[PDB]
Amino acid sequence: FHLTTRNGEPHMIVSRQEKGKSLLFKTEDGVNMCTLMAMDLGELCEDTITYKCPLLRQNEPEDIDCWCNSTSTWVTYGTCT
Amino acid sequence: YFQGMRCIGMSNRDFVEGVSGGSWVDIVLEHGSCVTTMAKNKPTLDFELIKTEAKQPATLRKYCIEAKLTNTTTESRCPTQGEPSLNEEQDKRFVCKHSMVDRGWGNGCGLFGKGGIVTCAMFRCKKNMEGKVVQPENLEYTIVITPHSGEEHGKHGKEIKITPQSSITEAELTGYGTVTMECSPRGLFNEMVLLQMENKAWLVHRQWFLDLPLPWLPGADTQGSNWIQKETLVTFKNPHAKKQDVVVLGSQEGAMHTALTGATEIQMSSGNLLFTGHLKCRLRMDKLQLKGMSYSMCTGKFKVVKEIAETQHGTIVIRVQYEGDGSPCKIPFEIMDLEKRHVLGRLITVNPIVTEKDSPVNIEAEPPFGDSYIIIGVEPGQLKLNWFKK
Numbered sequence: 432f433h434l435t436t437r438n439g440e441p442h443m444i445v446s447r448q449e450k451g452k453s454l455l456f457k458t459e460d461g462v463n464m465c466t467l468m469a470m471d472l473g474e475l476c477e478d479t480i481t482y483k484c485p486l487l488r489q490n491e492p493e494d495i496d497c498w499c500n501s502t503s504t505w506v507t508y509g510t511c512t
Numbered sequence: 513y514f515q516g517m518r519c520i521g522m523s524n525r526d527f528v529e530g531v532s533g534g535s536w537v538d539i540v541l542e543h544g545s546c547v548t549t550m551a552k553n554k555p556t557l558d559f560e561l562i563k564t565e566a567k568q569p570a571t572l573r574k575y576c577i578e579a580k581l582t583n584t585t586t587e588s589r590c591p592t593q594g595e596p597s598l599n600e601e602q603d604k605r606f607v608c609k610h611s612m613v614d615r616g617w618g619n620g621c622g623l624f625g626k627g628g629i630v631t632c633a634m635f636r637c638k639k640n641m642e643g644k645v646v647q648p649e650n651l652e653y654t655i656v657i658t659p660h661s662g663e664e665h666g667k668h669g670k671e672i673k674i675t676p677q678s679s680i681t682e683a684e685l686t687g688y689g690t691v692t693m694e695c696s697p698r699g700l701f702n703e704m705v706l707l708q709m710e711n712k713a714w715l716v717h718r719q720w721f722l723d724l725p726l727p728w729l730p731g732a733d734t735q736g737s738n739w740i741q742k743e744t745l746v747t748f749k750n751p752h753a754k755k756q757d758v759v760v761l762g763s764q765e766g767a768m769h770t771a772l773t774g775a776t777e778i779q780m781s782s783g784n785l786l787f788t789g790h791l792k793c794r795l796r797m798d799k800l801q802l803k804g805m806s807y808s809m810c811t812g813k814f815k816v817v818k819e820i821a822e823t824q825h826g827t828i829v830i831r832v833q834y835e836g837d838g839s840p841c842k843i844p845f846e847i848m849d850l851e852k853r854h855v856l857g858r859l860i861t862v863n864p865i866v867t868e869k870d871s872p873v874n875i876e877a878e879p880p881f882g883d884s885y886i887i888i889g890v891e892p893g894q895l896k897l898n899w900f901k902k
């Protein structure tokens with residue numbers, strides 16, 4: 432994925448080929464691992480969606496399909512097939 | 513096939529003549545009909561209103577009937593943290609919505625409760641329709657003035673365009689001079705809009721049009737991106753802690769075509785709306801004159817080219833062909849009683865003339881009711897046709 436920035440926070444641009452894999456990237460705070468469970472993750476196209484993957488410390492995820500373990504990260508992917 | 517034939521062939525034809533000399537003469541013009549004016553020593557003329565169109569009418573409002581969405585972005589906050597915001601909320605191209613959604617430990621919040629959430633998506637119109645308001649004051653009427661000469665033949669009638677703001681018109685008729693005329697309308701727009709969907713249009717009510725549940729832009733807009741009421745073509749689904757789906761409705765063209773059942777359809781061409789106008793005109797002929805006084809009377813033989821035809825207006829069309837020499841020459845013609853003592857009836861195609869030898873010429877005449885003699889040419893071989901008008 433392409434790692435960029437959104438208002439100073441990390442921002443991942445995820446493509447279809449990355450469906451199902453842990454998204455790792457180094458940060459000043461160490462290695463950040465974000466988990467992406469987006470069922471509608473498709474090919475990158477004009478139909479993108481963008482939202483935040485919150486930092487989860489010691490809590491099961493609820494009503495979300497993206498979260499990270501060290502730093503809250505923004506995510507963007509396309510839904511085209 | 514000849515000059516003046518069109519009006520002769522029309523069932524709605526008025527014959528107008530003035531009771532004075534050099535005075536104005538009033539005529540009424542309607543689409544589909546014509547007027548034949550006649551005057552002593554002046555050529556007979558045919559008038560026909562052929563087109564009434566609005567040019568560059570003002571656009572009242574543009575409506576989006578099909579749109580696409582891109583750039584969906586969602587921002588949400590924890591309970592007790594206030595309303596979230598996105599820069600896109602300032603960008604007029606985006607449709608946004610603020611909602612509340614359950615938040616808690618499972619999604620990054622230290623407290624269970626409802627948090628504010630906001631979602632935006634770029635709105636892009638893919639197809640729109642237009643509502644226009646035609647100013648009666650600027651409708652353009654096209655009138656064709658044809659010299660009723662019966663000249664077979666290049667020889668197209670004089671076309672003139674006027675609006676209710678035009679001043680008196682001085683139309684030139686090649687070889688006859690000029691005829692002056694003024695016209696005034698007689699309506700529909702204080703209250704009806706003209707909706708244009710693709711390249712059809714419809715006459716619709718102002719308020720109905722202004723109440724349509726669709727995104728719009730005021731007429732003045734040339735930018736076309738800051739649509740108003742975007743939410744009319746958009747549905748924000750129930751939000752989740754960190755994201756929310758936004759879906760755009762499908763094209764509303766079919767919905768419009770349906771809502772436009774019974775509405776008066778208005779024809780249009782080259783982007784202009786066409787209507788069927790009604791004119792009242794006054795015309796003066798003091799500047800017109802007969803063509804060909806310089807000519808002399810034919811003294812050859814003519815031959816009736818075809819079968820004499822009866823018209824819907826109590827007249828007849830005699831197609832003759834000059835077989836003599838000495839043309840352009842004036843065609844000798846007279847209608848009399850069986851004894852050839854008195855002159856009866858009259859010509860509608862005044863002062864008939866042969867421009868070229870063996871190019872038949874059509875003549876429209878009005879025989880008196882009953883029996884008469886149509887004397888064409890002068891002897892040797894003068895034509896003496898018996899006619900019975902019923």
Ligand SMILES: *[C@@H]1O[C@H](CO)[C@@H](O[C@@H]2O[C@H](CO)[C@@H](O[C@H]3O[C@H](CO[C@@H]4O[C@H](CO)[C@@H](O)[C@H](O)[C@@H]4O)[C@@H](O)[C@@H](O[C@H]4O[C@H](CO)[C@@H](O)[C@H](O)[C@@H]4O)[C@@H]3O)[C@H](O)[C@H]2NC(C)=O)[C@H](O)[C@H]1NC(C)=O
Nearest residue numbers: 453455456457460461462463464465487488499500501502
């Ligand atoms: C969130 O999760 C990510 C990824 O899951 C965190 O980064 C990861 O953190 C792991 C530890 O939590 C780290 O494991 C290490 O394993 C080896 C370290 O040795 C350990 O030491 C103890 C003490 O003796 C031993 O008992 C035992 O042997 C342990 O294994 C080690 O070999 C480190 O290795 C390599 O990491 C990458 C991945 O293989 C290699 O490419 C690289 O060359 C190193 O050699 C590993 O350090 C795990 O690998 C690490 N993964 C990363 C950084 O991608 C992240 O820190 C977490 N953050 C928070 C805040 O929770």
